[PDB]
From a paper:
To investigate structural differences between IN 1F and IN GSH, we created an IN 1FNTD–CCD construct containing the same solubility-enhancing substitutions (W131D, F139D, and F185K) used to determine the structure of IN GSHNTD–CCD. Four copies of both the NTD and the CCD were present in the asymmetric unit, with the inter-domain linker (residues 47–55) unresolved in the electron density. Each copy of the NTD folds into a 3-helix motif coordinating a Zn2+ ion with residues H12, H16, C40, and C43. A potassium ion is coordinated by the carbonyl oxygens of V37, A38, C40, C43. The ɑ1 helix in chains A and C begins as a hydrogen-bonded turn at the backbone carbonyl of F1, while in chains B and D, a canonical alpha helix begins at the backbone carbonyl of F1. In IN GSH, the ɑ1 helix does not begin until D3 due to a shift in the L2 side chain by ~ 10 Å, accompanied by a ~ 4.6 Å displacement of the peptide backbone at L2. In IN GSH, the N-terminal amino group is oriented toward the C-terminal end of the ɑ2 helix, whereas in IN 1F, it is flipped ~ 180° and oriented toward the ɑ3 helix of a neighboring NTD. The overall structure of IN 1FNTD–CCD is highly similar to IN GSHNTD–CCD (global RMSD: 0.90 Å). In the IN 1FNTD–CCD structure, the unresolved 10-residue linker would be long enough to span the unobstructed distance of 28.7–31.8 Å to position the NTDs in a “proximal” position. Despite the remainder of the structure showing little to no difference, this change in the N-terminus is sufficient to improve concerted integration activity.
Numbering used by the authors:
A (entry chain B): 1 to 45, 56 to 138, 150 to 210
B (entry chain A): 1 to 45, 56 to 138, 149 to 211
């Protein structure tokens, strides 16, 4: 397995995967996988149509985060300002991407604006986890901020890592694999 | 299904859904759904990891388009400038939500820039008419809905919505968005 050690180290240097991930992906003894994490300075050892939206802030920038409740898959974007126009545009992209039937926000004046109500009307979305998810997202951003000049890039690096490089559960899937399985199954029924 | 006729007709004013989608979505006989389209003045009756990318232009603005070859699924955005930075950011966003293993593109200034190559290396993507046909259909759909939006930005996402969700066909009567989810889900089962 000695060849896999350099591969796992490059994997962790980009995505900061945990030791179970590296042990399984690169056929490493757990003792070796844990040493990669311990050596790293940045680390230590529902219905399918429901989404949650919230705005969080980092480095004086607004990050719009959507979470597929049933899977944990997230989409996020740095927006120029916390406005309903930016939220409506965001919802319209998401809605053409996945089956978005219901969206849960706080009563933020961006989520209650008429521009957003107009967007949900057009896209056929009803309006009516995310906090624990902003925490996890900001954690990943911190691990990778050094790899990006601008925050917007780090944010998208973090989303990539959460959806694809953070596996778990009975199936051992990532959140990206889960949402695809959940929606694909919902089609068949 | 007689009550569904007014609902489908109302939705077609908005999405301009093809007849297969209205028949499926509203439980209308094909012959009824076909009439709705005929009445409309604006209408008329490989590995899962492979994507194509190109820029197309409309109203003096730049639209970056990504096509999932195996399914016909599309993502598209109006970008502020044909630059490697904006293309790389688009690339990083796409790879976070789908399995992007290979991206076919032109050898132009933008898609061969070092910034785009940096994004591909970080995300595990390797670089290497379908895009032309999707460009003309997307531009065609944007034409049908352009009056519903102030800015081209919104009309583009409306067109992407319509193309992925409201244009069904084939054996299962799937949309392009249902086909990509089905194709990727099947790839997971095999792997
Ligand atoms: K450590
Ligand atoms: K017609
Ligand atoms: Zn680390
Ligand atoms: Zn029409």
């Amino acid at each position: 397995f000695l060849d896999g050690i350099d591969k796992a180290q490059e994997e962790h240097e980009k995505y900061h995967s945990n030791w179970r991930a590296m042990a399984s992906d690169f056929n490493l003894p757990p003792v070796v996988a844990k040493e990669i994490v311990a050596s790293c300075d940045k680390c230590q050892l529902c219905s399918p149509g429901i989404w949650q939206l919230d705005c969080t802030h980092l480095e004086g920038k607004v990050i719009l985060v959507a979470v597929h409740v049933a899977s944990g898959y997230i989409e996020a974007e740095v927006i120029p300002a916390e406005t309903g126009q930016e939220t409506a545009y965001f919802l319209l992209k998401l809605a053409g991407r996945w089956p978005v039937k219901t969206v849960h926000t706080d009563n933020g004046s961006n989520f209650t604006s008429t521009t957003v109500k107009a967007a949900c009307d057009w896209a056929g979305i009803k309006q009516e986890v995310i906090e624990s998810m902003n925490k996890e997202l900001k954690k990943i951003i911190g691990q990778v901020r050094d790899q990006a000049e601008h925050l917007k890039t780090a944010v998208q690096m973090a989303v990539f890592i959460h959806n694809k490089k953070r596996k778990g559960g009975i199936g051992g899937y990532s959140a990206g694999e889960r949402i695809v399985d959940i929606i694909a199954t919902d089609i068949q029924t």
